[PDB]
């Protein structure tokens, strides 16, 4: 009687605190470790929410509760399909693991020498500003590592889950020997 | 017997789906509406997680479970105090409501004419790039609305929850009559 209550509450207390943690610190801009915990919680949350609605539809309070449970069941299923479609289509255009981050669907692809570095774009703009400070690149407010201003890519790819856009370098200014600025516009 | 199970499960099914929604779409870069739902969920999650641990400490499985519950109770309380301290200190330096967003603790303050517009900074850098395109301002990859390039602030404030930084305009270039670029560095 009381023992079953205690095991029930203890397990749920752990889960609710875990949801609070991933809801407060589960962001790649805060802690990459907590972000992966949130993603594992969200991956488990889709079928659990669906399966919980399947239960409330098999054992409902009334007919309206049975229908609502089925609507919520499809809702959990539709959100997972939607997430998988966007993340897959983004991953095929980028190959980066930021494609699976629901928080960001705009990705900036910049080729630095051999490989291409992908970073999430917060604001989808028609223009992106490149700033090389003494040999260190900063694209659209976020750093991209070391790169020579002369070896700046003439084209930069932005990847949304439904379209891949290319940005050609319109303007190019050099502040120093390796310091400079450049702009990119779509077409 | 079975009826209590049905009402209990139906309520939790709604809650778990709501957590899934706010965990998947609760971001200001996706939907401002879903973001506020997440914040209401998180504000309710702190005392609920604490109160649930208080229960498992009053009615524990064993002595170790009683101690763990008390540790989680203080953990839920410490995270809320931490969030409130950062958000308040940020709100006093900025006055913006983005200070209460746990996802962002770096805020960019740019004075556009009469008032000052604040936007969250993803990457805390020592430099911030200003780009005015035909009379539209873009600071660090995100737009700030209409502004004249001539009317660009000589100083821009960055506000972290523990320090307020000022950025003086080092370089200034004009691409056109109202189009131009500028950079800001801290001190
Ligand atoms: C930037 C650093 C700021 C300070 C960091 C503080 C670190 C957090 O401190 C928390 C320690 O406080 C102890 C809280 O006490 C826990 C209460 O537990 C009750 C035990 O119940 C068991 C009963 O059998
Ligand atoms: C930024 C760091 C700020 C640190 C602040 C930490 C504050 C933590 O508060 C600790 C208080 O929480 C302890 C909760 O324990 C109470 C449980 O009560 C159990 C009593 O059992 C009665 C038995 O009948």
SS3 label, residue A145: strand
DSSP label of A97: G
Contact B90/B161 with Cβ under 8 angstroms?
yes
Tell me if A129 and B133 make a contact (CB, 8 A cut-off). no
* Phi and psi torsions of B44, nearest 5°: -80, -25
DSSP string for chain B: -HHHHHHHHHHHHHHHHHHHHHHHH-STTT-HHHHHHHHHHHHHHHHHHHHHHHHHHHS-SSHHHHHHHHHHHHHHHHHHHHHHHHHHHHHHHH--GGGG-TT--EEEEEEETTEEEEEEESS--SEEEEEEETTEEEETTEEEEE--STT--SEEEEEETTEEEEEEEEEEEESSSS-EEEEEEE-
Cα angle vertex A137, ends A132, A143, to 5°? 135
Tokens 């101690």 appear where?
B67
Q: Which residue of A has its CA nearest to B173?
A: A173
Q: Which of A9, A27, A123 sits opposite B55 (nearest CB)?
A: A9
Tell me if B125 and A131 make a contact (CB, 8 A cut-off). no
Q: B149: CA distance to ligand 2 center in Å?
A: 54
- Nearest CA-CA distance, residue A113 and chain B, Å: 23
Dist. CA B171–CA B187, nearest whole Å: 15
Residues paired with B145 in a beta bridge: B137
Report the relative pairing of strands B155-160 and B142-146 from DSSP bridges.
Answer: unpaired
Q: Which of A6, A49, A53 sits opposite B61 (nearest CB)?
A: A6
Q: How far is CA B21 from the centre of its chain?
A: 18
**For B134, left (φ over 0), alpha (ψ -120 to 50), or beta?**
left
Q: Which residue of A has its CA nearest to B57?
A: A10
DSSP label of A178: S
Tokens 């500028």 appear where?
B182
Dist. CA B92–CA A187, nearest whole Å: 43
Dist. CA B21–CA B53, nearest whole Å: 25
SS3 label, residue A90: helix
Dist. CA A169–CA B51, nearest whole Å: 57
SS3 label, residue A55: helix
Is some CB atom of chain B closer than 8 A to the CB atom of A85?
no
Cα angle vertex A170, ends B109, A137, to 5°? 55
Question: Torsion angle of alpha carbons A118, A123, A125, A130, nearest 10°?
Answer: -50
Dist. CA A140–CA A118, nearest whole Å: 12
Beta carbons within 10 angstroms of residue A49's beta carbon: 27
Q: Which residue of B has its CA nearest to A26?
A: B103
Contact A104/A98 with Cβ under 8 angstroms?
yes
Q: Which secondary-structure segment (H or E) carries A68?
A: helix A63-94
Resolution in A: 3.2
SS3 labels along B59-106: CCCCHHHHHHHHHHHHHHHHHHHHHHHHHHHHHHHHCCHHHHCCCCCE
Contact B135/B83 with Cβ under 8 angstroms?
no
Tell me if B17 and A56 make a contact (CB, 8 A cut-off). no
């Amino acid at each position: 009687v009381l023992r079953l209550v205690k095991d029930w509450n203890f397990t749920w207390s752990v889960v609710f605190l875990l949801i609070t943690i991933v809801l407060q610190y589960g962001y790649p801009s805060r802690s990459m470790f907590v972000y992966v915990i949130k993603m594992f919680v969200l991956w488990l949350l889709w079928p659990a929410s669906m399966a919980l609605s399947i239960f409330c539809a098999v054992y409902p309070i009334d007919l309206a509760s049975q229908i609502i449970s089925g609507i919520l069941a499809a809702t959990s299923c539709a959100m997972w399909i939607s997430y998988f479609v966007q993340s897959i289509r983004l991953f095929m255009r980028t190959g980066s693991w930021w494609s699976f981050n629901p928080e960001s669907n705009c990705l900036l692809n910049v080729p630095i020498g051999g490989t291409t570095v992908v970073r999430p774009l917060v604001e989808d703009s028609t223009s992106v500003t490149a700033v090389v400070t003494d040999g260190y690149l900063k694209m659209a407010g976020m750093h991209f590592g070391a790169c020579d201003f002369q070896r700046l890519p003439s084209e930069v790819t932005v990847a949304k889950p439904n379209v891949l856009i290319a940005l050609k370098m319109i303007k190019r200014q050099a502040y120093g020997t390796n310091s400079g600025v450049a702009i990119y516009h779509r077409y």
